[PDB]
Structure prediction request, 1352 residues.
Amino acid sequence: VTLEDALSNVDLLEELPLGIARYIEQATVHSSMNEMLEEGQEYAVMLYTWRSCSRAIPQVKCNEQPNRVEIYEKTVEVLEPEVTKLMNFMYFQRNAIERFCGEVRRLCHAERRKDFVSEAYLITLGKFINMFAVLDELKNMKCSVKNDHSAYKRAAQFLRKMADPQSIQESQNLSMFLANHNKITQSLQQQLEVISGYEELLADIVNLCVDYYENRMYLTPSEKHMLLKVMGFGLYLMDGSVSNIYKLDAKKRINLSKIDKYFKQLQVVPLFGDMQIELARYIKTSAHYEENKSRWTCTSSGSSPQYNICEQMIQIREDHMRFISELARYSAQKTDAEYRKLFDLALQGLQLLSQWSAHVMEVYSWKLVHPTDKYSNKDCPDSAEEYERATRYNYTSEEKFALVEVIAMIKGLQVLMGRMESVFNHAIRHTVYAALQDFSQVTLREPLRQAIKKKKNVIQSVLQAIRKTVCDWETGHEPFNDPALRGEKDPFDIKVPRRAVGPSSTQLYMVRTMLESLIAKTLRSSLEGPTILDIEKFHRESFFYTHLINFSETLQQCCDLSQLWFREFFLELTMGRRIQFPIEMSMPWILTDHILETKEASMMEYVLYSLDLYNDSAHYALTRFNKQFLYDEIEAEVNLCFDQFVYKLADQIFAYYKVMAGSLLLDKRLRSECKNQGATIHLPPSNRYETLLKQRHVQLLGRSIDLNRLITQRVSAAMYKSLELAI
Amino acid sequence: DPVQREIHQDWANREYIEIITSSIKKIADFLNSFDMSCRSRLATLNEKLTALERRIEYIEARVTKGE
Amino acid sequence: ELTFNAEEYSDISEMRSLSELLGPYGMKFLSESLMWHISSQVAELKKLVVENVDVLTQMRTSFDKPDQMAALFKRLSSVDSVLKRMTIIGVILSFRSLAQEALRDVLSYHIPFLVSSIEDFKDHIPTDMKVAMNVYELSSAAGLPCEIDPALVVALSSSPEEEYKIACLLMVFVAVSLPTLASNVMSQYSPAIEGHCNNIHCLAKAINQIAAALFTIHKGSIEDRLKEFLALASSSLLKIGQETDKTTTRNRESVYLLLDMIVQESPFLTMDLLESCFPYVLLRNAYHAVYK
Amino acid sequence: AMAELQMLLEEEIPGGRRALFDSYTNLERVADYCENNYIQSADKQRALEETKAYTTQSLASVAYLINTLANNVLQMLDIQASQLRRMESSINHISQTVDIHKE
Amino acid sequence: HTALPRGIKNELECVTNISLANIIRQLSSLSKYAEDIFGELFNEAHSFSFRVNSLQERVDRLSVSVTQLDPKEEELSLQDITMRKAFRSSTIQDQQLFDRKTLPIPLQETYDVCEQPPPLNILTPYRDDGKEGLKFYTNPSYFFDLWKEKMLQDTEDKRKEKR
Ligand SMILES: [Cl-]
Ligand SMILES: [Cl-]
Prediction:
């Protein structure tokens, strides 16, 4: 019992007296905003995957050139459909900013400011500002885009391509847009600062992310990283000519200390693709940072990795053991408890996987923004380009072994979890239904009883709106013989049914949203103590219901390592010097080849897991980026790297067993005699090739590879060469 | 009343649907694991057959003349 | 205070040299003496089973009730002796294997035409048991490895259903005892040995051949009795995977590897069966720990 | 038996395979029927219960067609496995015979 | 997703009938996906059926040839060691397993619906370096070309270091 609790009990004495269509509309607005986020994501993909067409176009060295017109004609033919995408992008961001700001103005009205906003919608608005950040940084990076347009604009004009005043002003606007750095961000600020009290809404958004992050209200790594990115860009926007985050902090409207602690512990997270975001940058570039430097500690990082993977690996390996040991034990009708346990495991497993994937990506992310040099790595050439210094030379042998460990532990558990899906799906739906019905039919009886008794008509309507919406009475009809319905107590039993189906998305959203308004004079004031805890409890636990209901989808999102291969951002930075990066700079091959090269015994059973990273990237290029050339390049890399994989594997496998043979037959007395003469003939280090030799169908890029067959081909050829040599 | 009734019927309707969709997923899983199981047997058959083919070519070479 | 080096008397070259000198007659006599000592160990094991017949009988049917299963284990006696004797049997069998493998290579070299017929004759049999022991006795005399050891059977053949239960309970007794090995510092798996310092890796061979022999003598189901053993062993080992005691879990991962060895060594158990009751990711991590 | 293999390779597997393709085209027809029968239905509750009936029947059908074809494919592989078993036995005898001759 | 029950007649029966009609369509889709699986299994197994038969008849007539062998008459000549090549077993090694031609049909279809790169090869005939315009945008063979040139240079650097 805290002092605050004892004081609350005392305060209770001092206080002792001596619409549905509404939520439906909000859900409509929320749903509409989300569609725009999806649309923005499409534009983010367009930018990130946009390679220079102009560099592939033959230039006109002089006005006196034969094919001058032909080239220009073909230039328009190629770039025109692409320029259209840019027009749409310009139009989208313009409308998106108006849309968002219009919503901010609505929620910041003097009267509305006193109103209630759902957490889910604050999050959505949070993802909106991040969308702007992403789109702006992508636009800032892509010189290819700006140059391609100019190449089109320069060709369309020389050809006198028919264009009306509107078409001309349209082209002029696009140029100005593509030529202005930070245009999206700058426009966002202008339209926000013209709104009185806008900083109060953003404060609510930031405070919510701080609360979620602190209380672990997230499942997937992307969800975890989104919270931080919102905090950052949020404070940045809240720090302008009309608002001041430090004075906001003084009034305790926000807690800069917590945010500072979060940024210090986790400094870099993915922004989009291989393009990362250094969280502390938002702080350092804020309008009032210079005069308030001493307030921060996350602004100091250095070229030193903050955490020791060795300490992290010990814990990870422990958790892998502890959880999988228990899970493996769970592989006529069950009881509620038995279904709940499987429910808990499914969640715990997803959370564990998320932690691991987060570890890998966060390490990789930090490395990308902190490329090494000669001072940190003696073997690192001073002429080595940034990307190679960010990947290849930026990992020690032990670091590369550890990463493959985590990657293997992730993919390994993912397989077990997947095999458990059918059982999970059933146990989860049973648990969510039971929890929902037990809460709505029984738990809500007391609160409803008091609302009716004390004429809390507003609360009653909400409680009844909830029960009416989801309740599934055993008799098909509600119990009209209920005393709490009249406001009186019980001298009473209700039989709650058990179905294996979760509530509809609308049912769950409405229930949570309505419960949220109760624990938000406020309605919360008119509620007893114990009942508020009950509502808060169910509201907290029901946060993961949607994730669990969509177990299959959630599982993949907790094991996403597809970004290790993509490097369009760094490609863009080479200014045409690189059409791609060699395989020695490619993470998947860096991690895989390292095991093949060192022949590390403890890692030999892990090597296929690092190779599997190509599947993740291939699938992502085909289903998310939706670009053919990206897959062509992944496939071409796998094609090259897999041949090397077979060669090196077969090579060391034959040598290993040849040495074993020579060692097994070497005279024992001779060994001892050589030892006694300080010339010990060293024994062969044991290894672990058996599992690799047993692989009969390796799934890679859709193909089924018989690794055993390929190795046999090489090993057989080695046997013949040995015999041929001896003779 | 007509709403409460519709909601009770919806729960029943959706459970039935969940049961069917769940079965469609068990069929899909069998298909996959069956595909993999047959891939292993085929590789094993291919492995043995290839060896037998080579062995026959070898024995023939012992009983015949050369070029 | 040993006066000899074991490796200079038991390595591949030595056992082959021994086979040269003793031939089929001599090496067969060698194995017979080995099996006798094994019979002695099995006789003592049965006593330990009878001495715990009640508890073991309960553990066999209450295998899915952890609380009761754990409480029953505390009522068992002579757990160390069961593990100690089975290990001895495993060692003896490991030696016989070295001798048989050596003899086999030697015979294929001296009498290829005879070996050629023996191999073809053993591989392509349908089938009756009494007639199979005759094909197996001939085969093993030529150093050929058999699924059922004729010599072991004969050695262990010296109430019919009272005896069968003991064999069944013996498998249970051993299955539930394995986790105990994790508390022994010597149960450390070594890459240099590709086994354990205290020879517990020989348990793989002991468990398999003793099962194949006993449940052949009693005309039971070898495959079923081993399936039961694996399930009970996998279950018992998974339970210690959630404990934290630095003592009882010291060599937990090295003991985990026994399951892999037991399945590899046994023609009646497959990696698929093992995977469904003990995920390889645990074994993978186990190997990593000991090899690093 | 070679007869059983020919029966599996030439009729039963190709047949049970086409019966699966027929289920592909026949079910999309049953789907449209369930929607058209509902549109013309004067008793909506009745039309639904009949759709549910076709749905349950559609599930039982697909599971049966796959099961039947699955068993056939397995029997085929089992037979081919024994073919290699007998062939190796014959090749070994040929090998032994040649060794005897060379000696 | 969208809305809730308003208690109106036939509201629920209509939406579920659509949901069930879709499920029956999924079963129709499942029937086709199963075919593709059983199909690629039959095809390979059917191919082995050929080899098996071809080998069996090859084994059968060899079993007869060996019967006719006669040690009493078999004469040995040195021209086998002088005029006739030595027996050579097959030395086939599979490589380049991820060429586009090995891409399974299902993934090929998912690939075709993906976005193609700009038709930059339209400007190829107008280049002076006789190079393909598309290679300045995307070049899959870049990985091998760079790795090959690296191995040759590393073979030289390593070769001149010993001297
Ligand atoms: Cl070693
Ligand atoms: Cl020898």
Remarks:
- The interface with chain D takes residues 112-113, 116-117, 120, 123-124 of chain C (CB under 8 Å).
- The beta strands of chain C are 189-190, 195-196.
- The CA atoms of residues 182 and 252 of chain C lie 5 Å apart.
- Residues 12-50 of chain C form the longest helix (39 residues).
